[PDB]
C-alpha cells in the first residue's frame, strides 16, 4: 500500500515549505501534511486509467463516408456518383480525439482500425442485398482508384479487407511515420521557400483508405455508410502542451475562427462571489 498522507502533528518549522518562489518555474511538491495536521491515509489507487495508453486508447470514429451500389453503366465520374470513396487517414477530423492528442507535441502509436458498414435502401427495394465492401489501405502517396472497377483495386501490394455490409473488419497498422514520432505540431516548412505551406507536413502521413462495394448492381440502389474507427495502442507521448481552447478550422493547422466566443466563463457576480 502506497501512502497518500502521513500522520503529521503541530509544526514550528523554520524550513517553511509553504513559502516558495513560483518565479523559478518549479512546482515544489507541497503536501497537505505541510500546512495542516494530517492523519495517515493510503492511496488504494494505481492510476491505471490516467496512463497515456488508456487516456488516448479507445476506438473512436475518425471518418464516415457513404458509398453506393448501383448500375454503373453510363457514368464518367464514379467518385462523384459515390460508387467509391477514398480518404487520407488522419485523426484530426474529430475534435475530441484531436484535442486529446494535441495535449502532446509528439505521439507514437500503432493503429487498430475497425470499419463498420451499414446498408440502407431508401427507395423502393424488394429485398436487402448481401453486399461486400472492399476497404483498401493504400500506402502514403500510392495511387488511389479512379473508377469503381479500376485495376488499382486488384493491387498485388495494397492491403485490402473484404467484409459483409452490416458486419465489421478489424486490422492493425503499425506506426508508419518516417520520424521517430508523429508531429502533432510542426513549426516549419517542407523547404525554405517564401510561399510554401506552414505546419501541415508529410511527416504525419498515415496512409489512405479507399472503399467500394464489390458487388455488381442490383435492380435497386443500396446506400452503404462506412464508419472508420481508430484505436491507438502502444502509445508513447512527449512534451505536454497547453490544451486547445478555441474551435478548430482545418486539419494540420492551429488556426481558429475569427470572432470566436470567449472561453473563460464570466462570473455571476464579482471576484468575491462563491
Amino acid at each position: 500500500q502506497t501512502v497518500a498522507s502521513i500522520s503529521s502533528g503541530p509544526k514550528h518549522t523554520q524550513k517553511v515549505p509553504i513559502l516558495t518562489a513560483n518565479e523559478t518555474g518549479a512546482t515544489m511538491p507541497v503536501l497537505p501534511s505541510d500546512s495542516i495536521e494530517t492523519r495517515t491515509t493510503y492511496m488504494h489507487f494505481n492510476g491505471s486509467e490516467t496512463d497515456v495508453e488508456c487516456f488516448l486508447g479507445r476506438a473512436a470514429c475518425v471518418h464516415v463516408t457513404e458509398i453506393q451500389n448501383k448500375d454503373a453503366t453510363g457514368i464518367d465520374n464514379h467518385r462523384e456518383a459515390k460508387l467509391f470513396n477514398d480518404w487520407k487517414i488522419n485523426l484530426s477530423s474529430l475534435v475530441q480525439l484531436r484535442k486529446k492528442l494535441e495535449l502532446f507535441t509528439y505521439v507514437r502509436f500503432d493503429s487498430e482500425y475497425t470499419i463498420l458498414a451499414t446498408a440502407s435502401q431508401p427507395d423502393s427495394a424488394n429485398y436487402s442485398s448481401n453486399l461486400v465492401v472492399q476497404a483498401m489501405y493504400v500506402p502514403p502517396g500510392a495511387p488511389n482508384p479512379k473508377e469503381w472497377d479500376d485495376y488499382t483495386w486488384q493491387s498485388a501490394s495494397n492491403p485490402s479487407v473484404f467484409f459483409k455490409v452490416g458486419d465489421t473488419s478489424r486490422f492493425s497498422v503499425p506506426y508508419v511515420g518516417l520520424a521517430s514520432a508523429y508531429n502533432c505540431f510542426y513549426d516549419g516548412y517542407s523547404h525554405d521557400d517564401a510561399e510554401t505551406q506552414y505546419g501541415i507536413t508529410v511527416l504525419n502521413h498515415m496512409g489512405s483508405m479507399a472503399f467500394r462495394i464489390v458487388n455488381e448492381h442490383d435492380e435497386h440502389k443500396t446506400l452503404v455508410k462506412i464508419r472508420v474507427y481508430h484505436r491507438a495502442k502502444h502509445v508513447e507521448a512527449w512534451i505536454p502542451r497547453a490544451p486547445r481552447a478555441l474551435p478548430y478550422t482545418s486539419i494540420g493547422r492551429t488556426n481558429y475562427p475569427k470572432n470566436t466566443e470567449p472561453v473563460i466563463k464570466k462570473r455571476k457576480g464579482d471576484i468575491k462571489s462563491y
Partner: protein, 41 residues
C-alpha cells in the same frame, strides 16, 4: 489471474501494453537545477 498468447507475428498486432510503472512528474514540476554545480556537460 490473466493470460495472453501472441497469435500474430507482428508487435503491432498485440493488444495494448498496459501501465507505465515508473511515473515521475519531477521532469515537469521540478526542472530547476543550479547551474553553479556544473551539471551541464
Amino acid at each position: 489471474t490473466f493470460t495472453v498468447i501472441n497469435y500474430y507475428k507482428d508487435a503491432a498486432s498485440t493488444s495494448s501494453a498496459g501501465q507505465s510503472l515508473s511515473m515521475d512528474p519531477s521532469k515537469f514540476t521540478e526542472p530547476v537545477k543550479d547551474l553553479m554545480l556544473k551539471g551541464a556537460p
